[PDB]
Amino acid sequence: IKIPTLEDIDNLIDSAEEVKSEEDINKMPPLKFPVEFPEVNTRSIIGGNNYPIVLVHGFMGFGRDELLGYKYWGGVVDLQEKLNASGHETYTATVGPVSSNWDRACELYAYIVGGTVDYGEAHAKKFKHNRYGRTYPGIYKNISNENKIHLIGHSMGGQTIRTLTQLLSEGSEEEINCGQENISPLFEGGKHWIHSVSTISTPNDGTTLSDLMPAKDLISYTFGVLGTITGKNKLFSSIYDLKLDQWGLKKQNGESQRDYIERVLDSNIWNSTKDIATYDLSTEGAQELNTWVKAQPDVYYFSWTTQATKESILTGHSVAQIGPMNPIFYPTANLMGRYSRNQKDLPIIDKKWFPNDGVVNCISQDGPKLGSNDVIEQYNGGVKIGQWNAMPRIINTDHMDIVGTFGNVKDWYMDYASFLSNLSRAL
Ligand SMILES: [K+]
Ligand SMILES: [K+]
Ligand SMILES: [Zn+2]
Secondary structure (H helix, E strand, O other): OOOOOHHHHHHHHHHOOOOOOHHHHHHOOEOOOOOOOOOOOOOOOOOOOOOOEEEEOOOOOOOOOOHHHOEOOOEOOOHHHHHHHOOOOEEEEOOOOOEOHHHHHHHHHHHHHOEEEEOOHHHHHHHOOOOEEEEEOOOOOOOOOOOOEEEEEEOHHHHHHHHHHHHHHHOOHHHHHOOOOOOOHHHHOOOOOEEEEEEEOOOOOOOHHHHHOOHHHHHHHHHHHHHHHHOOOHHHOOOOOOOOHHHOOOOOOOOOHHHHHHHHHOOOHHHHOOOEHHHHHOHHHHHHHHOOOOOOOOOEEEEEOEOOEEEOOOOOOEEEOEOOEOHHHHHHHHHHOOOOEOOOOOOOEOHHHOOEOOOOEHHHOOOOOOOOOOOEEEOOOOOOEOOEEEOOOEOOOOOOHHHOOOOEOHHHHHHHHHHHHOOOOOO
């Protein structure tokens, strides 16, 4: 009926599942990776790679040094550590939790290479924000056409990694042509640093959760969800940063976390620019991204779809599955599960959009289709470069469960890392 905001923090905390110990997560049934790499049981794989994985969080995800150690990737299980311990070189990148995909891609570039974020003169002028952002040391500084990586992005992270791959490969005409000093190499094109792009629970065609909500309310709701993890009091402690430096929205000297959050929530940013996550998450905004962010011909693309709704036999609406769906997502799942729209200049939303994972419509997750020329095929026991390999649906699994909040997923990720290591070179 009603999506809660911070006004309803008490009821959210009340309805929420308790955070579990690592021991208790390990007692849950492990998620099973569904396939073997093609031909592994018919012949020798001879063309594999040693490229590392870089993990990229979604909307309202935070870094390894935030949330008092609770990890985006695995929660109380440190998936990065487990992957490295089992021989799968893995890093974690951290970008703006509520910034646009463009801004996040520029941040991701700097996070990997090292240096100061550069959003582009042209872009920064157009959207009226700073050209330069924060400074990072670099987690994989030697990245190159020879030293490629596998990008894995959850939620909005999947849009962000598509966007980085587009910019690396083809650059930005607007940036190239504006005649700025010391253009970021990101915008020049010609870089083939990415071997694969994997999206997990990604709004590749947006999510109608953004369409149906006022932006401020969506953000406020998501602070509520964060609170179910941090605890309602620790939610207002200095254990996370919204990273809106470019907008002049850093926490002020002497400002409390609570005052900082209220100030950001009350900002004009949420209804006054398209250069923000809430726009980029909407179906209109995702469609716009899709009109220029294409699947590159020399990169493997994989998509994973989560679902935790069932169809109501009475109305045809999709509703939360009791058990699999976090109770915090009951209202979001149920509103998306009955949201239609047939309005000029906007994507037509019909019953195919109803099934969801609490946050993102299932139909949106297999790859970009709105405004896209990308090819999508369901995985058929062979991998195809330059197009989307839409992998077997991850049913009975909500939006956060697939990153360990809450689920036993470490073996799935280790098996996926093994799978990715078999991928052979572009011809
Ligand atoms: K909206
Ligand atoms: K769940
Ligand atoms: Zn921007």
